[PDB]
């Protein structure tokens, strides 16, 4: 689904990347707002 790439990172990316998460951690950044548990 490059679409959903090309349409996470027109998004993603342009809204928020190109200031300090950049792409990389990235990963991390956004699941952390979307995922992270903090249990441990």
């Known amino acids: 689904t ?6 996470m990172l027109c998004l993603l ?3 928020v990347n190109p200031i300090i998460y950049a792409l ?3 990963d ?3 699941a952390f707002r979307s995922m992270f ?4």
């Open 2 to 7: 490059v679409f959903a790439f090309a349409s």
């Open 13 to 15: 990316n342009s809204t």
């Open 24 to 26: 990389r951690s990235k």
């Open 28 to 30: 991390l950044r956004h």
């Open 37 to 40: 548990p903090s249990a441990e």
